């Protein structure tokens, strides 16, 4: 399962951001198909619930090579829900920058295991249980607000 995680990180800037991929160290555009050659770490999409999206090929068959080969990409295409898959996705590109294609309210943010990694300036955020109705169906997930 975890073999579908893109691992192409490169700490050229000597910042040490790959540490957050392992442990919670003190940190202190339309959705299209992206190549796994640039992605570093898990790719999360928010439906609004947080979901990980693994590496696939150009057709959609699952690949388990950690995003090594140039053929491995990420299937990031969805309409706006309920009919669509997700509203957007976030991930870290291989040199340590956060990319987007989680913000419910300008004050809150959908919490997920790597929320502090993608958004470092969200540490001093209390947690709130949020019920959200997207087309009649409810979603009980945790959000990180002020």
């Amino acid at each position: 399962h975890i073999n579908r995680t893109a691992l192409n990180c490169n700490d050229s800037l000597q910042t040490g951001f790959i540490t957050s991929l392992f442990y919670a160290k003190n940190v202190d555009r339309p959705c299209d198909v992206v190549s796994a050659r640039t992605v570093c770490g898990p790719v999360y999409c928010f439906t609004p619930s947080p979901v990980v999206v693994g590496t696939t090929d150009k057709l959609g068959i699952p690949t388990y090579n950690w995003g090594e080969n140039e053929t491995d990409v990420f299937m990031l295409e969805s309409l706006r829900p309920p009919t669509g898959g997700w509203f957007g996705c976030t991930w870290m590109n291989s040199t340590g920058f956060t990319k987007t294609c989680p913000w419910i309210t300008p004050r809150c943010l959908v919490d997920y295991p790597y929320r502090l990694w993608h958004y470092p300036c969200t540490v001093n955020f209390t947690l709130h249980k949020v019920r959200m109705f997207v087309g009649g169906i409810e979603h009980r997930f945790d959000a990180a607000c002020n």
Partner: antibody
Amino acid sequence: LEQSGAEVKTPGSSVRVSCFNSYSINWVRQAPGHGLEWVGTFIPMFGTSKYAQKFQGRVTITATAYMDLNSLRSDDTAFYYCVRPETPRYCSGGFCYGEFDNWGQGTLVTVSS
Amino acid sequence: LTLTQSPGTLSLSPGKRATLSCRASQSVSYLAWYQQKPGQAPRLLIYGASNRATGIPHRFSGSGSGTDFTLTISRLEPEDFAVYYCQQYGSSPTFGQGTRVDIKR
């Protein structure tokens, strides 16, 4: 770091040596009167393990840390330091490679008949 | 792949400058320098050929690229007489031989 004490064994037997942030478990050996040889490297977060060529089919690194060396030889007589580095420099599927930072106190292994 | 350290033994009195060389048989910048006092475990000194590890004195400095790398100590101290190793961690981890530094006499 904390490691096991020195143990004397016979050829062909098996040894299990024991071994704060850490992303990998690196084992490095030093033959008395020689340089430094790199034994395998294990990553618990991903479950992968990359071993050396001469130690290909007879070493395993389980998960405290452990190192299993099967089918011993007279050449394996050396100190065995385990390294648990802190920050990784680059990942390239499915491992993350970096320098050796926190070294162990040392575990001497002697293999004689 | 094989690293070649020169010179083998380096005779230097306290206060003098030390310069080591780590010749690489192929292109690499991913190189590390370690010192090992007799009886102790190795201690990381420099990572990435240039960057200096945390808590390492300013005297330990390194440079180089490609095949030729150089470790330089500003002024030798009595606690700096040990064996020194260079290690490549960019592909398969390989170490160099000893580069012993002793008290001159």
